[PDB]
Write a protein that binds this ligand. Sequence first.
Ligand SMILES: CO[C@@H]1[C@H](O)[C@H](n2cnc3c(=O)nc(N)[nH]c32)O[C@H]1COP(=O)(O)OP(=O)(O)OP(=O)(O)O
Ligand SMILES: [Mg+2]
Ligand SMILES: [Zn+2]
Ligand SMILES: [Zn+2]
Ligand SMILES: [Zn+2]
Lengths: 8, 44, 115, 67, 49, 49, 528, 82, 257, 428
Amino acid sequence: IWGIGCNP
Amino acid sequence: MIYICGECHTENEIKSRDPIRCRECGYRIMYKKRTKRLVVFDAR
Amino acid sequence: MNAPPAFESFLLFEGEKKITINKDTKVPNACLFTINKEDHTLGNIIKSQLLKDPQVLFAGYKVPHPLEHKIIIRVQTTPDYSPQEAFTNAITDLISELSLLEERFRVAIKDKQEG
Amino acid sequence: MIIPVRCFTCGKIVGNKWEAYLGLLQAEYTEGDALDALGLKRYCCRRMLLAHVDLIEKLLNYAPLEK
Amino acid sequence: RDGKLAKPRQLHNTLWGMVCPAETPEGHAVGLVKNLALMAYISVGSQPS
Amino acid sequence: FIGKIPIMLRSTYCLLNGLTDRDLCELNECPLDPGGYFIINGSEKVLIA
Amino acid sequence: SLKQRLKGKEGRVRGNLMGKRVDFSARTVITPDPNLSIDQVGVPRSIAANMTFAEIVTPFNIDRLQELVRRGNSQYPGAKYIIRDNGDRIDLRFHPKPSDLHLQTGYKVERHMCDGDIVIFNRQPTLHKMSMMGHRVRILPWSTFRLNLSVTTPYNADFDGDEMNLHLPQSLETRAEIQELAMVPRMIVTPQSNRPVMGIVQDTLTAVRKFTKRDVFLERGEVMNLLMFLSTWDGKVPQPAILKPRPLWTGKQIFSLIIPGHINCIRTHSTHPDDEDSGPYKHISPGDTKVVVENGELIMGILCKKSLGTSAGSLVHISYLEMGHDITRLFYSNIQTVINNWLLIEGHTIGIGDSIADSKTYQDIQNTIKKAKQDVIEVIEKAHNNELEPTPGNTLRQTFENQVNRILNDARDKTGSSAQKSLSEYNNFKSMVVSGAKGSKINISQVIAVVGQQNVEGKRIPFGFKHRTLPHFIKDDYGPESRGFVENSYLAGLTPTEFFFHAMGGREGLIDTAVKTAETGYIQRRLI
Amino acid sequence: QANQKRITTPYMTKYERARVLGTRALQIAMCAPVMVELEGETDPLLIAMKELKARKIPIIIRRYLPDGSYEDWGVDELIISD
Amino acid sequence: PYANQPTVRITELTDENVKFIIENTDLAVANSIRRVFIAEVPIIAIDWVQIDANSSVLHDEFIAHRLGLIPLTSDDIVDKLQYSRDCTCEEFCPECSVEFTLDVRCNEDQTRHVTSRDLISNSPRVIPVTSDDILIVKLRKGQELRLRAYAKKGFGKEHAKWNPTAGVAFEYDPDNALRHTVYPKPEEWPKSEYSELDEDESQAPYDPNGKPERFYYNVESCGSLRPETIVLSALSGLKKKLSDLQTQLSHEIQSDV
Amino acid sequence: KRHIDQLKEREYNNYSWQDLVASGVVEYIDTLEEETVMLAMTPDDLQEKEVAYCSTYTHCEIHPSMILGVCASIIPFPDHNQSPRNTYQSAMGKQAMGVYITNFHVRMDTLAHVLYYPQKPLVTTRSMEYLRFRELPAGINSIVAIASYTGYNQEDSVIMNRSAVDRGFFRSVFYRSYKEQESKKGFDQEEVFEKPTRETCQGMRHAIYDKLDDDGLIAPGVRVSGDDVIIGKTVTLPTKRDCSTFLRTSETGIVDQVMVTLNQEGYKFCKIRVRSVRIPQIGDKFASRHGQKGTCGIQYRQEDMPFTCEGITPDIIINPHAIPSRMTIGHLIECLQGKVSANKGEIGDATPFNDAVNVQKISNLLSDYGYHLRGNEVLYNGFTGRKITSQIFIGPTYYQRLKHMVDDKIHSRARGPIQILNRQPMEG
RNA sequence: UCAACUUCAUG
Ligand SMILES: CO[C@@H]1[C@H](O)[C@H](n2cnc3c(=O)nc(N)[nH]c32)O[C@H]1COP(=O)(O)OP(=O)(O)OP(=O)(O)O
Ligand SMILES: [Mg+2]
Ligand SMILES: [Zn+2]
Ligand SMILES: [Zn+2]
Ligand SMILES: [Zn+2]
């Protein structure tokens, strides 16, 4: 829910 | 004991091994009626 | 089902002492007063009044556990003074202060009314 | 179900004020003005009347078990 | 519920406005049990004639 | 007579249908009760879509 | 069939022999208790009255056991049964049995569980051996198991409705085995990663960070009150750091009395400038970062998860490796008690004002978002005009997605950095993040600046409808808003499409958790 | 085995300490004579710990080597882990 | 080495409120006086209920709860009444308790509001602060409430039903000069009613040698005890607790000797 | 405006939603048609001429908040919370105690929990009106401080005010109903409701059979402690076998209603309902409307709780450490809006996508009523009286009492009953 | 004071 590399 | 009727709210006395039907209304749901012994409630 | 009765908070059960005094071996001239069935109301008052005393080197109070009902007051005094004497003097001073407060509050009441 | 006696937070009696609150609301008073007229000052007490849902009136519609 | 595939459970875009995005059970049934949105209606059926 | 079909409550064939809240209270039924369930062997059962 | 009886889980081999339901076990909800020690657990009276321990009547304990027998099952500190030498179990619950109340050496009194009993405490799943640990019983009012908060991390337990199993050893031999092999102070350091399993956590960690700042100065009464809760105190008040104008101690000076023995440790605080070590003020550290404990005295530093947490070389780990497990138990307990009372003084909170940022900060965040959206538009135009060229190993679609993702992630990071610059010293989000007690800079940034890109299956929000994400967006829109980017913060409030896309991301996370449990469990069973 | 050719560790392992303390405790609770002079200790496990500290527990541990052989190490001979 | 001499100035005195200021006193003494206001002032409240007939919608223990929370005038006899534990007689008697009775039936069609007025006390000094009224229950036609209750002396430490006060407002250092509370942005914070600062100055200058004094109290009565006598009873009860403590301490010191 | 004015006069104007549909104003669109339709979330923001995103909108959403279901519609400010937290709140709101139905007295349902004093939320969503949450609410508004007080709120637990609990706060009634049917299976073997006799009936128990009336059924109004005999049923033995029902262990209730009827078969059928009044303990589970729950860590009296200058002590203290990781900012906004509403006298509007209710506007409104903009308040420590140095966030938040209570979960075993096949301790 | 089954909840 954050970014592509983070968390969903 | 004495059972209060569900619908007409008239107490009827039904002996043991007797069908549960109130006289004068015929409703088949009776209620046992509150006990004579009294329970103490702490207001807390 | 495990709820303690409310009266346990302040009513001593039979065979329970309100005050037990045990000396503290780690330091000379120190004592530890355990008050049962008491709370912060008495503990903070006594600790403050003990702190006001100049010959009291250490004064503190603690509730060892919130669910249980006990107060532990450590008092250490200077040589030539006794921690028990410091505790008694604290209690008497607080009693005197409260009595003066009562008299002056009664006077203030009577003056706010009737004028 | 019925207006609680005593505000939970402080303990001021709010049980006697529900019928007066409803009457003041019928008068014209806004909820806040009615709460002020009843003397409720702290928001803890105003929550008691403002958020109360009186279900006792709905429960009284059902007929009693014993008449 | 036994199937561990994370495809049938995910909130699809087409669920917008018709199935609640928030309300789903958690456990073996995440995303498999759904709830209607407030304004959603379900067709009752009609004769095509 | 071929059988008995359980009736969904507050549907058109339920006795509670078309009754004002006062009449529902006379029958000891809640005006706010949604209906949509069957009473089978005394238990309320809800068909899940 | 006979095969089905013996075959799987719930079969005889696995469901009845490898594991089985056992007696002398109690399950109830857990609630916190900062006042209990690490090894102590809090047991309700009813649980303690049902469970029993058989004690052999000896000449030295015959009087106490006969008193317990006289009390019986009804009065709580009593005995449920008396087992004779023959094996006959006289029952103390049912009827006085006045002739059978007598005790002689060799009889076994099944006394009720009392304070000081050793019990195994368990939480499911028992992933590692720290999930079953031996605790010393303390009987407290009310109906929940009460455990120290340093012990929550090994059990993976939080007090939000969790329950814990309790198993009571029934023999002196197995009681000694439990006490030595599995006592909680003996389990502090894990063999899995040669790090402590337990550390200071939650309120105590934040309050320790605040307590050990240079600013903290404690007057005489506060110092005495805090020393009251230090169990290992020698009874001597340290000479205050500031003798004049008014005698004022320091938080570090009092925490030095907590640190046991003579422990030497050097750590660094989380907000330690990398420049400080290279440049001047190495040992002065203007921010009071770094941490130096010499001779068991905190000379300088602010403590956080890096010093008092579960990591190798921590003050906790050094205490275990140097002073022993008993003294380390006392160390944990004393930290929690005195720092929780100072926290009663100072206080801690979270409010809306923490989420609010400066007006300039909000303006900068908005400008960064505008610039990023404009750059994404430019990239989309390059792709549409076919100017874009594929990155090696990637298709044109993949390289376009990567470029857009990079732009959006860099803007998100810049907005997050602006939000974090905005934070004051008093900010409580920052307090919890700096201490390491809870939260992360990612959370602060999402709260204050930008929630970020919502991605499902490692890609931006997919085109679930026909060639578009939602019906509100036009077909073939690859811009940030269409594909899931959430520019509003949580405090600002997500717009409806951002809300749905955020729901999609959260759903993916929940599905991942639920699916994960079973596969990992199978793997663990196979390995064992 | 003999006093010579003992290959196992001189230090008592944690498991040996646990089982020795538990066994001695159970014996003490079963009216077994107590070697050390208890200083008002009425708990069998505490008395067993006290005996272990004084190296007066009358037990010899038989450690089975994986080849099938055994070595008899007295509790006194073993070095207490704690 | 001795206790300070406190001074009291009463600013407001109304049948429901006492606003006063205590000067030259310790923070611990002031806080514990407030604490005794809340928890350790004796009062009279119903603690025994026996419901002969309850056909109301509310169950019996709900009715008992509501009856216990009802305040009862305890101005004078609460000091005369003994605790039930202290009283020699078994159960309850006129010296240890007060008896109330409720016999209400809704014969009429209109809903009957059972109020505290319907509670009838055997002793005139204790009345349910009726001299609207607290609503115990609403009765539909054909619904009846009959009960007997006993009201006993007690203080708020046992149960909140025995709290004599509604809200005790306690404030010290109205302008932050001891810096006991450190404002992150002082200007955003509203001024206190007792504040003497000018509008420009958010906080008073830090006083390094200061100690909390001049405590401000506003004690609101629940109607059971007059707000003046709440404060007087609290002071007297705290003094009595200290004197009992001193007696036990002297006895134990003598025993040690 | 014509349609809206006629709907506003809905009753005594005979204009309804169906007339709105018949006019062609609104239309029902399914997912397949949703694929072929350009929608606008709002008319003003989107249809009106601007930098032209789309100039071919074919439909407009009536209101975005309708994308949520029944349970998520009660969540106030759901757009300010993390997404998993709204799922958690849906799940927990299915578990809150309230008045489930108004006819709860007539119904004899096993495991019925009904709250003493339900309250409607001070911060409410508009769609709640259509969920009847005002009519049958579940939960109480409570003064909540987000603070670390004594460590008993740590992790996810919650400190509670014992005085408030003593004044009726979150007190519930648990009704358990027991059913027993006398039946005849063998021609000579029958079951009869009767008070069992020690000599006449072979099977008996230590449990007291005195409370049973002549018919064999306990009368209403009798206190029944755990393992007492609710219903006395004896079977003729081809002397008699005791099949009498007993209370569930630790029920400890008072009989409410005893109904005696005839089932479809014609046999006598008895239902007995038992009241157990459950006061909040220090194991019970309470949750906000924002997906963060917790058991009661400890209960402190009003003298011990921290107090404000006005004398207000929080009903509930929750640990601050809950907020940061979960990012449930809707909780903080709901406390602020509840404070504003309670001081103003209105009921706050927390519809998900209002766009007319910023946090700054709520803060400015709270400033007018004499409080700090952000809702922080100077709290005085209850034990010592000293001002807490950090000003603490206090406000009225709606809390729900979940059905999970410690008394139902506490269990212990010591050489009890054992299964026949495995000869191992039983399950449950 | 049985046992199978299902479903629903709790981590
Ligand atoms: C943290 O991990 C725990 C454990 O792993 C254990 N657990 C829980 N459910 C299961 C399950 O189905 N199967 C297995 N094997 N274990 C399970 O529960 C996990 C977390 O779950 P959550 O993510 O909901 O914890 P919140 O973050 O939600 O805590 P709030 O703020 O409510 O107190
Ligand atoms: Mg949990
Ligand atoms: Zn009839
Ligand atoms: Zn109030
Ligand atoms: Zn008497």
